[PDB]
Structures are given as C-alpha cells and as structure tokens.
From Swiss-Prot, chain C:
Subcellular location(s) of the protein: Cytoplasm; Nucleus
Originating species: Rattus norvegicus (Rat)
UniProt protein name: Major vault protein
Originating gene: Mvp
Covered residues, full protein: 420 to 517 of 861
Domain comment (free text): MVP 3 mediates interaction with PTEN.
Residue windows of the MVP repeats: 19-78
Swiss-Prot record, chain F:
Post-translational modification (record): Phosphorylated on Tyr residues after EGF stimulation. Dephosphorylated by PTPN11.
Name of the molecule in the record: Major vault protein
Species of provenance: Rattus norvegicus (Rat)
Entry comment, domain topic: MVP 3 mediates interaction with PTEN. MVP 4 mediates interaction with PARP4.
Complete-protein stretch covered: 469 to 517 of 861
Biological function: Required for normal vault structure. Vaults are multi-subunit structures that may act as scaffolds for proteins involved in signal transduction. Vaults may also play a role in nucleo-cytoplasmic transport. Down-regulates IFNG-mediated STAT1 signaling and subsequent activation of JAK. Down-regulates SRC activity and signaling through MAP kinases.
Length: 139, 96, 78, 141, 49, 49
C-alpha cells in the first residue's frame, strides 16, 4: 500500500516517425478513505493486476500524447507534455493536475519523474550529435 | 463529430469494455519504417538548419549594430580631428 | 566495535582493564551509554573513562591526499 | 522501528538507545539506494539515518542542442521532525519503500525536464543557478 | 515528407524575410545617426575650410 | 604545555625552566611545517619557538 515508484520504460513514435524509448519513475500509492470497510479492501484486490494495467494504460496514453507532438518540441520539452497529456485537465490549455487516480481499485499515481529520452535510432543520435557539434562551433 | 464515450458494452452477456490503451502502431512493412526513418532524419537536419538560420540572423544583426556603433564613433573622431585640424589651419593661416 | 586500534594509537589491551582515551585539548569526543540510555560529550585535556555499556561515537572523515568520503575514520573530532 | 506480532503493535525508537526485542518482535528492514552512484536494491539496512548528509549521485541529461552530459550532485539532505513523541509521523518516516532512490530519481527527472528546455551554452555558462531553481521551489524575490 | 519539408521551407523563408527586414531597418537607422554625426562633422569642416 | 589527566588540568611553561611531569601528565606534541621548503607534517616537536 505504501508509496513507491514503478520500474518501467516505454518506446513511443513521434509525428516525425522517430521512435524513442524512455524510462518513467511513476510515483504511486494506494489512498484509503477507510480501513474498517471490508468492501473497499475487496476493491483493492479486485484488480487482477493493478501495476501492469497502470503501466499499460499510461503507456497507451503516452503513445496517444506523442502521436500528435513533434519530435523537436518533445526533445526540447518532454517533462511537461508527458505529464499533462496522459492525466488531468486544466488547473490554471492549462497544465494538468499532478495527481492521477484509478477508481476501479482506488489506486493513486503521483508525479512522474523523467531522466532519459534517448532515441531508438542511434543514427538519429549521431544527427543530434552533429547538430550540437555545429552549436558549439557557431558559439 | 464529438468524441465518443469511453464506455463500451455487450448486452448479450452484460460485458463492459472500458478505455483502450495504446503503445504501438508499427507498420507491417519495414521499408515503410525506413521511409519514416529517412523522414525524421530529414526533420532533425532541417531543424539544425533552423537553429543555424537563427544564430546566423542574430550574429548578422549584432555585427550590423556593432559596425554602426563603430561607424558613428569614426564620424565623431573625425569631428574632433576636424576641430584640431581647424586650429592647425588657423595657426597655419597666420604663419603663412 | 573495532574502535580498538583508533585508541591504541603490539600487545593486546587488557579488556578487563577499564578502557580510556586521552582527549587532545582542541579535540572533542562523545560517547553514548546504553545502560543509562544517555549520551555524554567531553573535550579538552580530560581522558575518557567509559561505563561498560558506553560506546564511542566513531566519526568518518574525508581524508586521502585530496578528498575521500570514507578515510581516516576517527572519534577524535578537532 | 520494530513490529510486535504478539502485542500486534509496532514501536519506533532512535538515538543512543539499544533495542531489546520481545520474541515475536521483528525489525523493519529497509532497502536502500546504494552502489557507486545509485541502485534500487543495495546496502539494505534497518538503521535509517535522520542526520544531515549528502547523496552520492550522478545524472546524464540531454540539452536542447542534443548534447548529452553527465553531472554529479551532492544533494544536501536531512529528515525534519516536527515531533518525536508521535508514533504516526515516525511511521510516516518509514512508510516510504525507498526515500533516497525515489528522491534521486524524481530529482533526476526534474533535472531532465529543466535541461530539456535550456540551451547547452547558457547551461555551461550558468549551470548552478538553473539546476537548482528549476527542479524545486518557486519565486522568492 | 515533401509536405513537411515545404512547410519548414516556407516558414524558415518567411522568418529569414522578416529578420532581414528588421536588420535592414536597423541599417537605415544607423545610417541616420551616422548621417547626424556626419552632419556635425560637415559643420566643423565648413567652418574650418 | 602539558595536560594532566589526573588533575584534569592543563599547564603551560616556557623559558629556562625544565619540565617535571606528574605521572598522568602528557606533552602537547605539535606538528610543524618543515622540509626543505614546506611540508604539513615534518619535524614534529613539542618545543614551540
């Protein structure tokens, strides 16, 4: 029931047809409005597999997020769009709420950390490498 | 028109499908994947052309403003040099 | 708890003999008593004399030629 | 902290006091994120540290110019305690499966989300400011 | 791919157009203040000559 | 200077007077920076000048 992070990685295709893998920490915990109720506790275990369903549904949502987004804006700003587009609505368009929730079993995902967005294609990495190599010299 | 309801239902047995997640849409044809690969490969390089165009326009504008400054300083220095030259013309006038 | 060599700084100490440690004037040390459930601190030119349940507060130091997170561990803080 | 199966009751303790278990009591062992940099399961220990210290961590990150770069971070840290007499808050202290790995990972993703917008030039000329402001906190001036 | 390339091409072309227009206006401006200092220099040169 | 563990008291002395320790008393040894130029630990001595 305690707070923890999922170990997961997801390949995704951008609008520019440039597939790329990315790991996600997935902060999560199981909120409990009550502990004296057998029924809600039954709801906690009612799911055959909360974690795989979570990672898979969130994965499909990430695919449905990146499917519209261009590779450039994504590479220059992954952490924002990767969070806002897979859960939550306007809060301020407006950036989505950090909280995420699964009613079927009372699950609650928190903020999702990012640390890697490396392209599946190494040649693309070579291209960006030549690009930044152009950047240092123009500087 | 409007986006369809997330719920789905089968009356024949009371089944109810929920939202359908996605994570892969890879083409059966690998050559097509090669085509999109060349396309995004075009994308990264045209973006490099974009940043290069930005840095080029910026450095060009800065060099323009700079040469304009140095030019104005040249005209100024020519002005005080014109002053001292004028005094020299005065002394040269009286001497001649 | 292998704090022996730090305070010996040949023949093994008589463990039945009371443990003791001279404290250098600018040095500071502390020891916690499991029996009294109470820590006590001391510094300056006064040798320590532990109760049997008392234990030294060993402190890791950053030594090495330049810096290193675990090197020259010592209870004698300066 | 240790949980008593016999009394059906957990109890927590810290500071210079040795533990003395009842036969049914069991230690609350805690996995830690150790290794030379970070690792989800390494140096497991029941002796959680409350005192000030620094994380040993390093993070690769990609800049907008597609120039990936590693960087170590000291991460000064400690565990604030509004109270010590409350069993509940102490339970909250150990409620996390892995505070350090979650910390370093979340902060890592935040650093990635910081550098993802920033250019390599301004970052190289001014890393220490943006690396701190963009991963936590808001306006102060 | 020809479509996206056409889009990026038209966009970069328009941006370079607006940019060169800006730098051009700055050129005419700098020529204006340079004309001012040149005018003062013409005054001093006039009195000197 | 020498510190007395027995009296729990340090005492200092200098000039032409020989030291005579109590059994628990110990010298305040001092590291010096010696060597041909400089060196953090060389020619350690209790006789500060």
């Amino acid at each position: 029931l305690g707070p923890d992070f999922f170990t997961d990685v997801i390949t995704i295709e951008t609008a520019d047809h440039a597939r790329l893998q990315l790991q996600l920490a997935y902060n999560w915990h199981f909120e409990l409005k009550n502990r004296n109720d057998p029924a809600e506790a039954a709801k906690l275990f009612s799911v055959p597999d909360f974690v795989g369903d979570a990672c898979k549904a969130i994965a499909s949502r990430v695919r449905g997020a990146v499917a519209s987004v261009t590779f450039d804006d994504f590479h220059k700003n992954s952490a924002r769009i990767i969070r806002m587009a897979v859960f939550g609505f306007e809060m301020s368009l407006p950036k989505a709420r950090d909280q995420a929730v699964f009613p079927q079993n009372g699950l609650v995902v928190s903020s999702v950390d990012v640390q890697s967005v490396e392209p599946v294609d190494q040649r693309t990495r070579d291209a960006l490498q030549r690009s930044v190599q152009l950047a240092i010299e123009i500087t | 028109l409007p986006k369809a309801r997330d719920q789905a239902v089968f009356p024949q047995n009371g089944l109810v499908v929920s939202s359908v997640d996605v994570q892969s849409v890879e083409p059966v044809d690998q050559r097509t994947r090669d085509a999109l690969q060349r396309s995004v490969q075009l994308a990264i390089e045209i973006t490099t052309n974009s940043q290069e165009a930005a840095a080029k326009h910026e450095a060009q504008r800065l060099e323009q403003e700079a040469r304009g400054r140095l030019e104005r300083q040249k005209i100024l220095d020519q002005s005080e040099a014109e002053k001292a030259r004028k005094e020299l013309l005065e002394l040269e006038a009286m001497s001649m | 708890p292998s704090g022996v060599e730090e305070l010996l700084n040949s023949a093994p100490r008589n463990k039945t003999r009371v443990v003791s440690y001279r404290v250098p004037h600018n040095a500071a040390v502390q020891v916690y008593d499991y029996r009294a459930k109470r820590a006590r601190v001391v510094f300056g030119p006064e040798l320590v004399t532990l109760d049997p349940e008392e234990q030294f507060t060993v402190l890791s130091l950053s030594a090495g030629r330049p810096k290193r997170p675990h090197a020259r561990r010592a209870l004698c803080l300066l | 902290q240790v949980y008593d199966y016999r009394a059906k009751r957990a109890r927590v303790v810290f500071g210079p006091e040795l533990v003395t278990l009842d036969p049914e009591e069991q230690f609350t062992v805690l996995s830690l994120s150790a290794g030379r940099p970070k690792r989800p399961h390494a140096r497991r220990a029941l002796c959680l540290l409350l005192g000030p210290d620094f994380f040993t961590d390093v993070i690769t990150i990609e800049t907008a110019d597609h120039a990936r770069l590693q960087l170590q971070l000291a991460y000064n840290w400690h565990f604030e305690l509004k109270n010590r007499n409350d069993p509940a808050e102490a339970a909250k202290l150990f409620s996390v499966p892995d505070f350090v790995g979650d910390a370093c990972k979340a902060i890592a993703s935040r650093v990635r989300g910081a550098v993802a917008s920033v250019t390599f030039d301004d970052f190289h000329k001014n890393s220490a400011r943006i690396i701190r402001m963009a991963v936590f906190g808001f306006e102060m001036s």
